[model samples]
Target: ELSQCDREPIHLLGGIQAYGVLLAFRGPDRRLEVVSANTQALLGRPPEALLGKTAAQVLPAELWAQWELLSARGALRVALPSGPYRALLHESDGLTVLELEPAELQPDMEETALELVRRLVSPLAGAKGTRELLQTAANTVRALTGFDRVMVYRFDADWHGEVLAESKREGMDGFLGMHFPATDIPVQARALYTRNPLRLIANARARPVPLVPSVVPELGRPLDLSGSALRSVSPIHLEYLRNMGVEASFSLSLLKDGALWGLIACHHLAPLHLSYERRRACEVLTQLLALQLSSEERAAEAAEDSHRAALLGPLATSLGAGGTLEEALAKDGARVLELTGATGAALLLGGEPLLVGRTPSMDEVEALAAWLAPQPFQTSFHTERLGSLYPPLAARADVAAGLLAVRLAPASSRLALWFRPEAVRTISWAGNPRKPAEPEPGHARLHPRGSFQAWEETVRETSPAWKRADLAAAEGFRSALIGVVLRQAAELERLSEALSRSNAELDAFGHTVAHDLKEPLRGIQQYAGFVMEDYHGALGPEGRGHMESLMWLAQRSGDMLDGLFEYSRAGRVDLAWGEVNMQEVVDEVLATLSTRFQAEKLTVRMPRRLPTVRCDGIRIAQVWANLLVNAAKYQEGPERWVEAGFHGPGEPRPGAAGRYASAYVFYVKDPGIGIAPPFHEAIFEMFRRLHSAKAYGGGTGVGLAIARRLVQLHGGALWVDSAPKQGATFYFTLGRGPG
Candidate 1:
């Protein structure tokens, strides 16, 4: 069952506010197709009269020409017999949708509105920074609209808002610098804001007027008011405003890069309605302000990047020069701390820590390194509240409240970490940030908190957050270090040290190269499949055979690439280990291979019960899939079967390998041609194919190798037991085999 919130069809609300009417016309011909029933009251024409008639027939020549121009130009204003109206034209579902609202104003008032818009435009062009521009815009909106309060709200990356600037009538309290939680504006509301751009509530206390016919007959649903300016709002939002003592409100979206950046929100203590002409002017003003804001922000970002490059370039050059890793990074006046604004920095090279500036104790640094060793490698790791991530770090919160660390080498436990100290601060909320739930007949329901009073809370044990520039600087330094390491490895004459480092570098390189090869390999396989399946009729028997061979080769190559990707990912993808039911895991694996099983007419045998084991479900499932599919591939006779079961500790299974003697052993046995004892161990080696491509079907020979890697990643081993003509069995353990 879906939740009520999820079921709410806010988009297809099928109605507009009583203040306006919407008319949709078919394209090219401009014949009226869907007319709101309220057209009779607003346009002096009934729905039946307007339906199926061209705009030229229903409207005067001058108005019809204006409509045509609006369709061509996007938005337009024209004087109609009823009154002045502002119309915006947009296309949806093969229909041209025109939203018409009364633009009530005398000629003198129109002149004043135009003059006000001109005035607003000049100061906005002259404004320098984002804050100054928004402050000026907020003041201008309040002055022009006569609203009691107006706020320029900016959304953070997390969608929480902070009031950057505020303008209010005399003697009113200001909300500048206050923050609001993301929940204050729901996801659906934000989506609507993106589509509509401007929303107004003329009288929050007034009852909502429903559309005469709730649903449109043609659509068999409510009309989608996503682009309607006069769409009725959610009732809960109106109740929220009433609780705040606001009788009227207006919200204009501030868009940047085609996303909702924030909003200019207005509030009134009593009902206040702005003329349609004035609202249209505000919309134009908002768009102009958005353009100016985008321009200024880009300029500021470029300036900041230039400054950062100047500082980071020197540090990178110093690190590239020959010296010990510690000496190169922590030399006089050249340190990671200076580059990233961190107060403390540490280097962990080959599992040993070298500290600089105000870091935690050496013992604490080693503990931190140990914690990071087993985790999947990331280009950079960062956290503002380090204590929250690693609880023991709370004891050293004064010096290690935040951390930004970069992986200096992919295959080694080498890292450079920067730290920031805790800086406690107080946060103010517009209300008790905690929303309360009320008891209803069937269930408890969450309601918006009814308080608008100022509420304050103190936050502690957190550091000033690291900015994007800081992370970028760290990445730059890491790249420089990698280059230096590569250069040093090439220059070294010490055989053993150079060999060890070179091997590690080679492994990382192999993984990177193989990953890059998979995309094109996959594309070739997909296109080959497409040609075989979709264009089969265009080929003769010989041509079809050639296409089949092409597809087989492409598929084999793709399988090889897939094996390499999984092998590379085995060590890198984070393991989510927990207790898993082996029974469920087997069922899921079989479901994935259902097509193969059906095609081959193969039967699978499962024991009555399988043990619950601790493992990463996804990786373990891959193991089962490979072993089962491998069994199906080797089966020879008309009757093909595979059996699976679990063995308890020291059950005397063949090919035990003694590595997992104390762990539960899982085995898959196949009634197929068996492997020779001599080649049993050799078969698991990567790319060691034994049979010709025509015999026992084609394979990449990397499946068992990848399976072994994943098993080893789980602190276990995989091995097979077989002889020339005997049926083969494969055994593996999840943890050290049973005691």
Candidate 2:
């Protein structure tokens, strides 16, 4: 509702003010397609005589040829039977429109601008600053056109207008520091500023002269008067000019990098006119000054770039000697805030906002980050007024009115943000900025506001706008931060890899040591047996008993060595991982131990159905059998039953190793003789027994060690829960990553 002016096509306003004549043509044939109805009064040629004929037949060839050579609001003069006319040739896609106004309309105007042009050009090299250069341009423009007021207006990043220089006639109140809303110049209006550098409103209330044959068969519909010099402006704009007591007006677009940078606006207090020659000189003069203005801005941008880099130097140095990103930010937060000229800053780590500078309370900043989490942004997003975009923060503008945010990670809720406090300054506007136009009662068209009384507005919930240079510096800071993070992460990865390699080498060394020691034990046992058999007659009974004892000790040593060999092989075993059935693996373990289970009088129970899991079937069966056998051997008080089933789904088990994102936990429980809490970890050590050699009947203490190694190799963990004389439960999870 507030943007009604942008809806109307400014180019299709359908007519031109009667100050000049308009002629339209199509094709190289130069056929006169359309002519203004006022041509009879202005050019001595009526519309009917000009239509359906070649322009070359009625117009001078040399004059039209000059337009064919170049483009865009060209200044060309021609001799017509009526008078010497100044031609504004606008060439476009498939159509060319020629606008003519008599050059001699003002008899006292200079024929050429060379003398005054020298005055504008001579100051270019000597001007010390952009402000002095623009003031000179404004004074010269006022002298050339004799307007009551002139303003060199500059546009901000938001397209809002502010007057930087003004030259007004004596006794007129100045509007040097006045501001204007962006909506006053609608989107389409500003677009043509680049296409036509010069536009004039001769008389605010004049009637328009529309061209004939609004639709030619080949011209499709009506030709656009967008490029025409005398194209009638929107009624809203005309009413706006009149409300300000502007009877006539001239505006020249000021551009840098081919985009509208500002404007040279001239307003007359009475119905006024400028000869075509004098207007042309103003257009030429403003273009030159715009170039100088652009140069001054470019240099200023580089100076800021240098200033920001120095602020980042110490921050970069602190990152390398740090602990984590948390510590680094805590130490250098203020420097980071100064790098972007923000009053406050925050870095969103995984779960909290690391507050810096005079930022909002942590809770407020956290809510702000939460609000922006769902926004689809690029690497960065910035707004001068955050409260307007997000109404929940409207009352909190004193602390965080402006926000410039940078995303640190693409997928997570991590971002870096800087805040700007509200400036709360008063604006002296040229008119009411909020309602420049209102909808008429019956027709949907809008009527311009009735007053231009220098209304004053005190604004809050807004901060100073962020410039391109500031955004660029923030980007530089992000890059430097990422470099530190990457380096720290790389160091962590290198350490983990080194530990894994060491574990692998120790396993291979253990395999060799086990085999080498087993061979010597085998030789000792065989030779002792041979000596006892061959020399029993020559030895005494005591000697024979000692030899038998030595052989038995060698047999026990060989059992320990064999257990060491199996433990070493478990880690290096090729998993050949599969979708294994938990029930099938359990059934196999029971079948293999059926005879032993009968001897021990043990009963195994499965209270529930088993789930399919990821594992290497052979190695997984060993883990189950080892636990079941241990349950069978360690028993008391005649409760010989053991239970096995899944105890994990949607339950989080965080281990000392790391948190596994997904896993399936299987546990074996038994009511049997259990070890004390102190011996739980000790039981998993290689061949290390918590009980004496005779207490558990002298079996090798390596079963738990082998089971634990196999589980770890599959990216899982195995642990026991038990206390003295209580039942024991053995648990394991298969969480092989990428499976």
TM-score, model 1 to reference: 0.50
**Winning candidate number (TM-score):** 1
Candidate 1 residues 289-340, lDDT tens each? 7787788889987877777767766655665466655566556434456678
**What global local distance difference test value does model 1 have?**
0.72
Off by over 4 Å in 2: 1-4, 24-32, 42-83, 87-98, 105-111, 176-181, 310-339, 343-394, 403-418, 423-739
lDDT, candidate 2, 609-694, per-residue tens: 66888777877787888788666657764768778876456754334212333367777878877677678788877676767666
On lDDT, the leading prediction is 2
Q: Model 1, stretches more than 4 Å misplaced?
A: 1-3, 22-100, 108-114, 309-338, 342-363, 373-401, 406-416, 420-468, 475-739
- In model 1, the clashing pairs are 14-223, 660-737, 661-737, 662-737, 662-738, 662-739, 663-737, 663-738
How far residue 139's Cα lies from its native spot in candidate 2, in Å, is 3.1
**What CA RMSD would candidate 2 show?**
22.3
Error at 403, model 1, angstroms = 1.5
